[PDB]
Design a protein around this ligand. Sequence first.
Ligand SMILES: O=C(c1ccc(Nc2nccc(-c3ccc(Cl)cc3)n2)cc1)N1CCN(CCO)CC1
Length: 541
Amino acid sequence: EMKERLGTGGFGYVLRWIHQDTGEQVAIKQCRQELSPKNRERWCLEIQIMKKLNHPNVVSAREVPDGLQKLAPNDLPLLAMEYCEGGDLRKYLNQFENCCGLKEGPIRTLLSDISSALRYLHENRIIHRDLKPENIVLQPGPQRLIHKIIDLGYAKELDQGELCTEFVGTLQYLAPELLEQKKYTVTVDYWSFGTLAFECITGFRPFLPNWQPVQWHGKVRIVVYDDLTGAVKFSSVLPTPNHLSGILAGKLERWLQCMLMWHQRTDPQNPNVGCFQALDSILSLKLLSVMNMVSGRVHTYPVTENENLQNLKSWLQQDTGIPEEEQELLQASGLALNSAQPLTQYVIDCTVGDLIFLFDNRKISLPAHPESVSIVLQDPKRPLTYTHLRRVWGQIWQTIRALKEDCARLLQGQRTSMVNLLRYNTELSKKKNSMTSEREVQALVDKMMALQTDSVDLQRNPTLDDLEEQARDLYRRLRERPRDQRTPGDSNDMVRLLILAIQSFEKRVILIYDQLSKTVVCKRKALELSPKVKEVMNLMR
Ligand SMILES: O=C(c1ccc(Nc2nccc(-c3ccc(Cl)cc3)n2)cc1)N1CCN(CCO)CC1
């Protein structure tokens, strides 16, 4: 005897037999009934097929674990596999705080894994009829966490036969191809995968709220967005309230917008390669990211090796904005960019960081904030705010979260320009205690312990985070609200939390400028008042 079950899918059950002694991880697919006769053959088509080949984005076989081996409620064999450790991709997709879907890069991991998974399969003629976030494992990985496609109970071999013919479990996703039960080619995996990614980013699709058979002609009645009543929507042209970049929302609105349809949909502009290098190009892309401290804010760049600071400058120029000779470009803390070295060096993409960029002037202080439309009137009204606030309510804080991540990304946007002082200050401070032992000793320790004064104020200093926790709770106290009692058309609490997040993004903001400007005049007319004390407080001998 050995341990517990795992779940349903395909022609039967999956089992977790944690070995009696050695402690291996064994997972068995077994047949449900006797379910004869050609399915009795086709199950043995499958088993041989799942053994045939392997690669680290889909599981491999295991053979026979002789703790009992074949106990069985059948006169029919079994298939055994490796059990792995991070669960289903859904179990993760399910996380309370992973609301609003992903704002990730593990998305990246995901796509580029499942892609290389799927490719394999079609290169090997194995159209995996479906694809479930339920059939995918976020496997723990030492280098970078791994994805492994599973559950091959439903595939077309093309050359030897089919696998099942059932829609067992939860249909929910999948293409017309099988929904209409019509004739089909590979095109379907693109659907599943695409609609997988759509979820991987948003948490939804166009769409799943309205069940399925049943939405079968919410088939944009078609490449477009769609309608509501209060607030429902079934769209693929532009996703809503979730970050990833400003140019992977590129990808989406082009990658998804291609492979999310029926019968030959591939990117109409190009006889390229679909599931393939179409994705990986728009994936592998080397990303630069300038933060303009004029709070013209974020920029973003597709940079090679044949492009160094020289090239980077010209871009910052023609954006938002301003010419080249007022351009301080600080790599995190300290160093500028050095210099005729390709930008291919300062990107760094996911394992366990940013170009901030500054100006030469007096100081101006701009707020101006990110937002989503399906949040606009959500505060100025309690508008029959129905059962589903697992859209709005979550979104509330994910818009508040975005603000945190912004002040945060201006704390390290500004207090990354005061290390430009601390170094410059002391380098040009105590060089005047080795070359100041020597009469006009007036403007030596006077403009030294006064524009050290306007330097000591800022180097140790402390609402909004005290507010993230109040969001952290409520917009969780909904899933943690039982199946009953929920429904009353009620908004209320969220409103203030947003405005108080705004009432911080109007104090945290300008009073980072009373750190900024007090290090832009205390860097110029502090370290430019040195050349007339450097080698003017020298010639007296
Ligand atoms: O936490 C998981 C989970 C975590 C990971 C997975 N994915 C996973 N990984 C390694 C081997 C396998 C596996 C190994 C062999 C086979 Cl034949 C089928 C699946 N699946 C699937 C589920 N849960 C939560 C508890 N559930 C309820 C109790 O089973 C099951 C799903």
